[PDB]
Structure formats: structure tokens, C-alpha cells
Amino acid sequence: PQSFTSIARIGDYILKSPVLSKLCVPVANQFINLAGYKKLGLKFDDLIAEENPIMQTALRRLPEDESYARAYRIIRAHQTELTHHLLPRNEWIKAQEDVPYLLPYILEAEAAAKEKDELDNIEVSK
Amino acid sequence: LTVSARDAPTKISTLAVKVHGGSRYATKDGVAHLLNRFNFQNTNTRSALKLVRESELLGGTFKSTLDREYITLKATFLKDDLPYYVNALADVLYKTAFKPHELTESVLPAARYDYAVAEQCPVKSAEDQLYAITFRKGLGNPLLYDGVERVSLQDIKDFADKVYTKENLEVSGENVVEADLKRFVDESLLSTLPAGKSLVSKSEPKFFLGEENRVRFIGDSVAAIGIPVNKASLAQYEVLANYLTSALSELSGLISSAKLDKFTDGGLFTLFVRDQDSAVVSSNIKKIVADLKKGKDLSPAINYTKLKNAVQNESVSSPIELNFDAVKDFKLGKFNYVAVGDVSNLPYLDEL
Amino acid sequence: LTVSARDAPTKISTLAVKVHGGSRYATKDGVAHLLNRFNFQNTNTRSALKLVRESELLGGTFKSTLDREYITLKATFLKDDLPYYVNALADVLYKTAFKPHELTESVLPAARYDYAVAEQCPVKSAEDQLYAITFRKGLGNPLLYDGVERVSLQDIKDFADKVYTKENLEVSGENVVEADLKRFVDESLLSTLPAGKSLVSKSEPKFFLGEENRVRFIGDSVAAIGIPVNKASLAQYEVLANYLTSALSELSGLISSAKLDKFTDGGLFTLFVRDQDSAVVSSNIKKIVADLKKGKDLSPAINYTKLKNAVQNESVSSPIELNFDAVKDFKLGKFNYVAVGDVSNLPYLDEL
Amino acid sequence: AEVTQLSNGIVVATEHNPSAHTASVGVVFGSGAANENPYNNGVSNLWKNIFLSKENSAVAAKEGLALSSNISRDFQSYIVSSLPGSTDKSLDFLNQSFIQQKANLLSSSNFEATKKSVLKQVQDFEENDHPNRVLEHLHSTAFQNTPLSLPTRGTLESLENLVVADLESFANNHFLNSNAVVVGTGNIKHEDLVNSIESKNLSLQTGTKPVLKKKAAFLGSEVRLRDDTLPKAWISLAVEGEPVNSPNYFVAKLAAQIFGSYNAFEPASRLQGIKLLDNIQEYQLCDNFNHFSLSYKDSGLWGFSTATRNVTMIDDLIHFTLKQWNRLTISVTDTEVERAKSLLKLQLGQLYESGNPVNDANLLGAEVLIKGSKLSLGEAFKKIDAITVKDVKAWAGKRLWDQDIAIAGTGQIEGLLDYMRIRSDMSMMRW
Amino acid sequence: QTKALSKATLTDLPERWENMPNLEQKEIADNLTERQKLPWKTLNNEEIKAAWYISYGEWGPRRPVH
Numbered sequence A: 001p002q003s004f005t006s007i008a009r010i011g012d013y014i015l016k017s018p019v020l021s022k023l024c025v026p027v028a029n030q031f032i033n034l035a036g037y038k039k040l041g042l043k044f045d046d047l048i049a050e051e052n053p054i055m056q057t058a059l060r061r062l063p064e065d066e067s068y069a070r071a072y073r074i075i076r077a078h079q080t081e082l083t084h085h086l087l088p089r090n091e092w093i094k095a096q097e098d099v100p101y102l103l104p105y106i107l108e109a110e111a112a113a114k115e116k117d118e119l120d121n122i123e124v125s126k
Numbered sequence B, C: 001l002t003v004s005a006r007d008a009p010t011k012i013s014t015l016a017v018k019v020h021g022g023s024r025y026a027t028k029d030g031v032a033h034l035l036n037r038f039n040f041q042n043t044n045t046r047s048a049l050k051l052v053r054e055s056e057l058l059g060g061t062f063k064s065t066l067d068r069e070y071i072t073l074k075a076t077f078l079k080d081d082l083p084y085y086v087n088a089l090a091d092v093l094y095k096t097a098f099k100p101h102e103l104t105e106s107v108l109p110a111a112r113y114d115y116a117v118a119e120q121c122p123v124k125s126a127e128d129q130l131y132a133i134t135f136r137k138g139l140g141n142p143l144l145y146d147g148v149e150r151v152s153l154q155d156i157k158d159f160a161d162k163v164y165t166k167e168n169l170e171v172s173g174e175n176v177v178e179a180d181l182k183r184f185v186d187e188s189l190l191s192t193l194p195a196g197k198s199l200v201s202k203s204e205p206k207f208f209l210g211e212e213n214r215v216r217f218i219g220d221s222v223a224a225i226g227i228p229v230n231k232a233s234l235a236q237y238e239v240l241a242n243y244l245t246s247a248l249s250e251l252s253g254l255i256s257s258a259k260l261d262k263f264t265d266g267g268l269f270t271l272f273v274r275d276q277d278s279a280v281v282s283s284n285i286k287k288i289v290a291d292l293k294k295g296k297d298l299s300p301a302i303n304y305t306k307l308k309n310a311v312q313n314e315s316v317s318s319p320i321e322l323n324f325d326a327v328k329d330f331k332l333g334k335f336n337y338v339a340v341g342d343v344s345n346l347p348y349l350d351e352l
Numbered sequence D: 001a002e003v004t005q006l007s008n009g010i011v012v013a014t015e016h017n018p019s020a021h022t023a024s025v026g027v028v029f030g031s032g033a034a035n036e037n038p039y040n041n042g043v044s045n046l047w048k049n050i051f052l053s054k055e056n057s058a059v060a061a062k063e064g065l066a067l068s069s070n071i072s073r074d075f076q077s078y079i080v081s082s083l084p085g086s087t088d089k090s091l092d093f094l095n096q097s098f099i100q101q102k103a104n105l106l107s108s109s110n111f112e113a114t115k116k117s118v119l120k121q122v123q124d125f126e127e128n129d130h131p132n133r134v135l136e137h138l139h140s141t142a143f144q145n146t147p148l149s150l151p152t153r154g155t156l157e158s159l160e161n162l163v164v165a166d167l168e169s170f171a172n173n174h175f176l177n178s179n180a181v182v183v184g185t186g187n188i189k190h191e192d193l194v195n196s197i198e199s200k201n202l203s204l205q206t207g208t209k210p211v212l213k214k215k216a217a218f219l220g221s222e223v224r225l226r227d228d229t230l231p232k233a234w235i236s237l238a239v240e241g242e243p244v245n246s247p248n249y250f251v252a253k254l255a256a257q258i259f260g261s262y263n264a265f266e267p268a269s270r271l272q273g274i275k276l277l278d279n280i281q282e283y284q285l286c287d288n289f290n291h292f293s294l295s296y297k298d299s300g301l302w303g304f305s306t307a308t309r310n311v312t313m314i315d316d317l318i319h320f321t322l323k324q325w326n327r328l329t330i331s332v333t334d335t336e337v338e339r340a341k342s343l344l345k346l347q348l349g350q351l352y353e354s355g356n357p358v359n360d361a362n363l364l365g366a367e368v369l370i371k372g373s374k375l376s377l378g379e380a381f382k383k384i385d386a387i388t389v390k391d392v393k394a395w396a397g398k399r400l401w402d403q404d405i406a407i408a409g410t411g412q413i414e415g416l417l418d419y420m421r422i423r424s425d426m427s428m429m430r431w
Numbered sequence E: 001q002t003k004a005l006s007k008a009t010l011t012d013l014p015e016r017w018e019n020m021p022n023l024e025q026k027e028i029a030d031n032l033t034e035r036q037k038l039p040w041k042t043l044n045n046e047e048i049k050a051a052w053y054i055s056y057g058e059w060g061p062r063r064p065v066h
Helices: A004-015 A019-035 A053-061 A064-082 A103-119 B031-038 B048-058 B082-094 B100-119 B122-134 B153-163 B178-185 B234-244 B278-292 B299-313 C031-038 C048-058 C079-094 C100-119 C122-134 C153-163 C178-185 C234-245 C278-292 C299-315 D043-051 D054-062 D087-099 D111-126 D130-142 D164-174 D190-199 D249-259 D314-330 D334-352 D357-371 D377-384 D389-399 D419-424 E026-035 E045-056
Strands: B002-006 B012-019 B060-066 B071-078 B169-174 B212-216 B221-229 B257-263 B266-275 B336-341 C002-006 C012-020 C060-066 C070-078 C169-174 C212-216 C221-229 C257-263 C266-275 C336-341 D002-006 D011-016 D023-029 D066-071 D076-082 D180-186 D221-226 D233-240 D261-263 D288-295 D300-308 D406-411
Touching (some): A004 A019, A004 A103, B002 B178, B012 B082, B031 B060, B048 B060, B082 B178, B100 B122, B100 B153, B122 B221, B212 C212, B221 B234, B234 B266, B266 B278, C002 C178, C012 D334, C031 C100, C031 C153, C048 C060, C048 C079, C070 C079, C070 D334, C100 C153, C122 C336, C169 C178, C221 C278, C234 C299, C266 C278, C299 D076, D002 D190, D002 D357, D023 D087, D023 D357, D043 D111, D043 D164, D054 D087, D076 D087, D130 D233, D130 D300, D180 D190, D233 D314, D249 D314, D249 D334, D249 D377, D300 D314, D334 D357, D334 D377, D334 D389, E026 E045
Parallel strands (some): B002 B169, C002 C169, C212 C336, D011 D180, D221 D406
Antiparallel strands (some): B012 B071, B012 B169, B221 B336, C012 C070, C012 C169, C060 C070, C257 C266, D002 D011, D023 D180, D233 D406, D261 D288, D288 D300
């Protein structure tokens, strides 16, 4: 329930700084490797919890081929952990392949919902 | 960028940007309907929700209308709110977002609703059949998108790039200062649109005569005739269209509707007979053309025609200014014919 | 009451009662279709369930087919069960119940299914448009009920006792002893049927040439040409229909299909070019008419169509006894034309 | 009726019917798509379609001959039909272009056009024809890694590696005198066919076909080609059935005829004497079904196929039809057997006794090729009339009661339950 | 002068070589012996895998003890 605009704001302030990007990005990459969702054949945007209207609009607005790829990666992850194994090492999601694909859709749906709730509580300056 | 305005001592202004981008100029069947239904969606700087909320708090409404020749962007508002509505129309023409999630969620269901309510009237069905058999691939393009040829989003962006040019639009204000409007349509984004070319032709639209089309339909039956009109014979067919639906005629108990659509380069006179059973509309349309093939004098209906033309060109102040004084007689020549409904009981063209 | 049979030393008999009661003889639109879907419902002495569950135990099935001329009542059964099936078909013709609950529960949903399955094929649409613009009120009737003019139950009863008359039917039996079939068709309820009039007319069906019709449709687009054929030049057009689809012609890869529907007073030659995109259909139909307007030597295809006519007269036993030897040349004259589908990109009759 | 003789190398079979107006000769080989690898899959389709090329069929059309051919699992036929006086023009055509001089057919610029149209044909098969592609997937998952698992049309990935060398290699290995029946149906007589096949000295090839190293074995399995963008749900489901030359061949045909076929939209298909209809009609569980008994050389299949739009109640459709299958083991009645006897005699009569002599040529060729002769229709009827209720109960206890099944499905088959619930439906707990 | 074999009868030979109807084992060994007579830069590397496997593959007499 942290909004992705907050995460993106803190993350962009980290990434555009010279000093703490070169400190904080290696510990993030080690965190990503130790997380081990890639060993199950999942990108990170398959991990975002989808039972909220923002993620439902983002998954509805996601294009058709990306949605089929996401559905296969989820079904393969369920089938993999059902057998208590991992995917073989040639089937792991590589680091250049782990892209944020759902993130622009989530960000525009979140900006639309925040603009909606700012306009619903608007006050004219009379 | 013709900018004209007509002042008044009046509370409510209105402001229309008319582009030549209607169904006459559609590169695919119904790309103009989708651009029209797309018009007041969100732009780059302002969302579509924010425009509706800010315009309500300022006190006005937007509308986008599609006919055969034009796409009209109208804004009705309180009088001293002019540069907001000018910049809103300029932003809509210049920088609309053209998002696929707006095509698939709000524009395509609205267009599907438009086509589904226009299908239920057999008069609009017969009217577009009439346009299609009189003019073929000019004005005979369909008004509304029905998905017969698939229109993608890049087609809508290409059509908007074609028709939203600086040479193809007219800014037309009512109850508004012309010096203020002319100051506000430059000092704007209407003055940095592409200066393309105006798509209107000065030629004649290549009509066709003696054609016939029959389509089956469940409901009311409509028999319709249609006559293409050149530019110089426009006033005579308008006096006929007002004579045939008035009390001067013996035929308006039979004629359900009759009108004349006027364009820059001519027009089309349409006549519709509509009823729920086919024997009535069959005998009616036989009587109409049998007594229109003998002549009719229309000089009784000239003053009535001047009145109806005044009350229907009071709204828009770009009318055609016909003369009406030199019209005397009419005799029906050749004409196109459309049956809609119970077509195996409606008469054929060679039986009229 | 023309009874004819044809023995064989085999296991399956096939009776057929064919009635001149097709769409060409329909009073209102689709009454032949509704009577056809009504055919094997319950009688006054035996239910429709009892008929099916006794015919299954005796080893045979009933069917009834509709086309433009005929309503065919076919019974395929094991060879030595013949009097049961002649009494079954005699009861269906003489005494069928005509209950309104049967109209609203079985027959109207079956007819609605038939119309909805034939509506999706654009070749059936183009074929009925072709028939309707060639022949207007006889053979050009709609084949299936679609509810544009409302058919009551009394209309179906009136059509049933108009066409189920003793002079308007033939009884034809494959693998039946002819003496026993003739003994079983009298001593039956085909002797009590009214000796009405035979509805077939030995005139010519008053065709029309040069007509054109365009139908909007979502999906495959079809361009169809249609030529009415008299009784004399019937076999020239059959040789043409078998020449255009065989490998003898270079146009067989462009033609989707081509056939000649034959009647007792002429027929209609139809040719369909169908695919999913209008550029190929336009290109192909322009090539077809530009090649057929020059001559085609049809004399290579004579023995081929002799074989094809023997093949298609094995299934039916309606012999028309065509010459095939005096057929030398073809050149296309005047023809009706139907464009179904993306009709803003299909060519008109002007351009063919 | 049927007569069958053996020449120097060729077996000849005729079914003379003197009241026909076409005669039809041809050659039926004995190696369909069950004699291919997974890598040359689609060779028999390419031979079917280069036998029916436009330049091969124009030569037949100038002489008044119509070509036909059929690719199946076991056999494949190449049939030339014409008028009764011109049987030797057909034998001459079949000899001089298919049998001996097949170097003009296998031209490049003919092979390329035929391969292109065959690729387009199977591409439009794999995405538009849904009941037949799930019957092919039922075959490909019931008999997997054995030769009966191959689609007869081939495969788009397989067909685009084929060259003319593969076609002529298959021709050398399988188009042989030891593998072929020369058929004649229509009103061609037998003595004239043998006199004109020894008048020309017709010889096909002289080798012997390779014998396959493994037989077809039924593996209880499933495959789910689910696609939520389709309107219906197509489900085929089958057990291992009887192969041909079984003693239980007609018992399997009769047991499939007990449950018959059904169409929801034909009013005389709702009034049949099947006890499954008054379970699946109340909520309209299916649009159609058909119960098949497919028999091959090695193995067989017995089951059903349905298409339904009631995608929420697929599992109860499957449950009700399998609980109707259980009645064959336990409580099938006398009346269902008599009704299926009459309907099976009618169905076999319409299949064999039909006007078309191309179909008679295919049937006679495959039957005489697999068992050396052809069973007459009177003997088939006397073998159908002898079936009792105990034969159906014994056959269903053997082949149906608590056996592994093979499932194939496409469309909206989310509502179709897993393998184990459907397999546990195959035997009720004696209630 | 014997040219190269088809692709789609030698793709992945070392796994379907033993499910092989045993006549075509002979008419795939002999043309490989024929094709070896050429200069050895002629040969495509699909057959050099196949020619090695028929000679030195772990099948038949080179089957493992268990």
C-alpha cells in the first residue's frame, strides 16, 4: 500500500544522485539476486499484488502479448514451486530481461486516481 | 484560419471550430466518427476529467458534432470566460494524447452506441443508402463506424494530422468580440498548427442517377427517393422541400419527411415515406412520384420558404444565401430510389 | 401422384415425397421455410416423439429439405419396412397437428437457428441477393424466414393445404419395388389428399439484367455475378460452370465457386469470388469479367462435364438430359452483380 | 459380391455395380501417416496434393477424368473416376503419370506451389477447424511417441523442411507392389480390369516396405490447448478401443451407437431414445456430441466429442456422459441394444451402400489391404444381429470400466476439471 | 557426385536412431559412406554429427554394461 509514485520519487532521487547511487545500487542488485524470483522464471512486475483497482486497470491496459507472457510466467512459477524445484539455469530470467513493463501503466493509473481525488475535494478561491 | 465573430448584448457566448473533416473526407469508413468521438478526450497537459471539472466550475460545456462535411467543436459558456475556452479548443486540436486505452474503453463503446441507435431508424438507413447510391466514394462514405473495415489508432492519428491543419478550419464565435477572439486565436496554439491545405473541392461531386437499392429490415418500412442537385438549382429544390412538407401540398399526408442537404458544391434532395405496413407506403410513394412527374408550381411557397430558411439559418452565420425569387415550376426527372424494410412488397424503381 | 421407383439388390431403401412448395411458391416470406421446419412435428394420431422412437427401433430416419422449388420429405430406412414409412409420410402430408405451442417451442427456434447459421456465410447472402435482383417476385423470394413480414400459424396452415395437394407432389423411391410402392401409395392417405392444382408454371420466369446490389458485412468479402439462363442454353452454362472450376481454366485459382442452378424452366448461373480482403476480390473479379468478355472455348470441358453431370445425377434423380455436344463457345453478355462485404472497396458494375 | 484376385505382384479388388453411371479405378497403398517420422510428417499430404496439382489434373480433365485421393492413418489411396466406357483411359493416366513417369509431377516450380498451398491449408486448419484439431490432438496424446500419434495433414513446422528428396524417398520405400491394392468400383467388371492390368504390363515397384520397430500403445494422458478467445469449448475424450480384425469390432460400433450423436438445434435430434438427453437437456449442457469407434491396424479409439457454450457446466456434462457409460458394464437394457442394432445397420448401410464410387474404392481398398478380403454387408448384418446384452457388458467391463482415458480440449476449458476427477468418474461406487 | 541428404530425415539422428525401422539404417549408412569420399570441407556439419554417431555412438555393441 505504498503508492508507486512515492517509490518512484525516492528511487529517482537515489538514481540521479552521484554518491548514493553508486553506494545504494550494488546493495539493491545483491538484494534482487538473493530474492530469487528470477530462479522461478518471474519478472518483478509479476510479483506486484493485483487485488486493487489500480493494478486491475494497469493489467487491463497492458497489451495483449505482454499479458500472455505474464500469464505463462505465472503458471510456470506455480508449476515450478508445486514440485519444490527451481527452473534450470538456462530458464532463469536474466538481468537485462527483468524490465519494468507494468510500471508506466501503474504510474499513469495512479496519477489519474490522484487527480480524480484531488478534483473531488477541490475548493474554489472565492 | 478564418476568424469571424458576431457580438451581442447577451449573457451566453458560444464558439465553434469547424474543420472540413467529416465523412466526405474519410480515408477509411468511419475514421471521422472515431475522431469525432475521440475529440474531447485527454490532451498532453490536461486530462479529460480536469477539463470537464474546470469547465463546470467556470460554467460551460463542450461538444463535438460530425456531419458529412464538417467536424465541429462547439463550446458554450458564460461570456467573459473566452480565452479559457479558446485555449481548450486549441489544445484539443493541437495535442490530443491518442492513447490505446482511450480507444478501447471510452471511444469505441461510444461509437458502438451511436451506430446501434442509428441502425434502429430506417430513415437514417435509407438516407445513407441514398447517399451511397447517388455519390459513390465521395459523399457516399458512411457517416458512422460499424467495423466493416477495421480502423486502427494510427489511422485516427493520420486522419487528424490530415484534417487538423491551419488552412482547413474556421473559427466562428457568437456573442463574442471579434477583436478579442482574433487576439485569442493567435496568442494561442491555433497559430502553430501545420498550415496544410484545405480539402474542399470546387468541382462537382460526380453524381449518379437511376440507381436503386433495397435492404431488408424488421420494423417500419421506408420508401425514399433522392435527387442530386447542382449549385445553381439549389433554391428550386429548397422551395420544393418546404412546399412538400407544408399545408400547401396535397402530399404531406403521405410524405413523412422531405429535406435538402446543401453543401458548398451542390446538394441532395431527399424524400422519405415511412409507415408500419407496406401497402400504405407503397401506394403513397407511387402517388408521390406519379404526381411529381406531372409538374408542380412552387410560387405559392416562396414566402414560406423565405421564412423557413430564415429560421434555420438564424443559428449558423455561414449560410448559402439563395435567391428564391426566380423559382416557378418543378417536374420530376430522374432519381435514385431506396427501399428499406418489407422490400418484397415495396415497389421497384421501374414501377414508379 | 406420380409414383416412380427403382429396384436394387441392396439393403437400404430411400423414399422421397417431393412437393412443389419451395420459396418460389411462397405466399409470404419464409412460409416455405416454416412449413419445412414444421414437417415432422406431431400428427393427429401419432406424436413426434412416437415417430422418432418407433423409427429408430425399425431402423430408419426422416428428413425434410427446402430449396427454391421443392419441399422434399425423405425417409431412409431398411429395405423391408416400406409400408410403415409410406404411412408415416402420408400422415405427415395429410394430418399434421399445427399447434401454436409447436410453433413457439420447436419450429421458430429451429428456423431462427437456420437463419443465424446461413447469415454468417457471405456467399449465401450474395446468392440470395443475386436471386432477388434477377427474379423479383417468383424465384427471387427469400429462402429462409427472418421475420421481416410476420408469418402466423394460419399462414402456415394455408400454405400447407395449398401445396400438399395430390397433383403437386411426386413420390420417388430408391431401392424400392415399384409395384409394391404403387400398391402402398394408394391404400394410404395419399389417396385422400385434395386433387388440387399443380403449381409449376411452364412460362418463362421474367428475368432482369444489368442489376446490382451492395450489402455491408463484417468479415469475408464476396463479389458475385449472376446470369439467368433459358431452357435452351442451359447446357452451355453447365459446361461453363464445370470449365471455370476445373484445372482447364487459368481462372480456377481466382474463382471461389461457380455453379448453375437448374429448374424446369431455365436456371441461374452464379459465380462467387470470396476472400478476406477487398483488394484481391476486386482484382480477381475484374480479371474474371475481362476474360469472360472475350471468348472462351468450352469444347475441352465437354467430357469432363459429362462425367460431372453423371456424378451429380447419381445423387439426385432429376434428369434434365442435356446435349453437351453443341457447346462450342462462350462470351459474356449482360449480368447482375452483387458486392457483399467491404463495399467501399469492391468495384461497381461500371468498372466491370 | 466383392471379388479379389492376385496378379504377378498386385492384388486387384472390384465391387461391380451395373446400375451405376460412373466407374472408378485407383490404387490404395498401405502406409498412411502411421508410417512417418515426426520429421517427415506431412509427406503423404504432399503426395496427395501433387497428385492433384493443376497441371496433373488438367491432363485428366482433357480426357474426362476426375482425380481424388485420401490420406488416413493406415492407408492412402489415389483414385481416378470416369464414365463407364473409359476405364482404360483412367488406367493409362494412373500408370503414365503417377506410377512410372512421376518426374514431371515432382518438378520444382510445381513442388514449390504445392508446398505453399499445403502450408496455407494446414495453417488454416490449425486455427479455424476446432473439433477436428482436437480429435487430432486426442490421437496425438493417446498414442504418444508411437507411430499412430501423427496428424495426417502433417505439421507446419514439419512441412516446411520437406523437399522433393523426401517425397521420392517415401515413394521408394512405400509405393510398392507388396503394399498396394488396385481397386475398381462403379460398373467396371473384374475380368476387364484384370485383362487391362495384364494388357498393359503394369508394375509399381519391387521392394518391400520397412517394418516399424514399435507398435502403437495407448497412454492415458491429457492435453489442454486452452484459448479463452474462442466462443465454445471443444472436448474429445476416449479410451483405448478395438483395432480392426477384433472379435469385438462390431460390439464397439454398437456400444458407440447406443449413445449415438445429438444436435441441440435439430428438433428430431432431441427426441432420440438416448437416456443421456434427459440429463443434458434441462440446463442445455452441450450443443452437440458424437460417439465414435475409430479402429486402426495396431490399436483403436472409443469415446466422444462435444462442443458446448455452457462453459460453466462442462464438468457436469462430462460427469453425466461418463455415468451413462457405466451403465454398459452394469445395467444396459435389452431395448437400448435393439435400438442400437437397428441404427447401426442403418449407419453401415449408408456408409457402404452409397452412390459415390470413390468412397467405395477407399473402403474396399483399406479393407482388402488389411485383411485380404472384404466382409459383405449381409455377413456384417448377421454379425450385428448376434450381439447380446452379455456381449456389451463383457466388452464394457473389459474396455470401459475403470480404464485410463485420453482427453483433448481447446477453447474455454477452464471449467473442465483435471485428469483425476474425470478418470475417477470412469467407475461408479456401485450406486 | 552424390549430393547431400535431406534435412528432415537426419535432424537429430542420435536420439531416434534406435527407434528406426532397420531398413533405412542401411540406406542411411551407405550414402554417408558415399558422401565421405568428397573433400571434407564440402560436408555440412549435420551429417558429420550423424556419421560420427553411426560409427562411434553408444548403441548396439557400444551399449553400456548397465
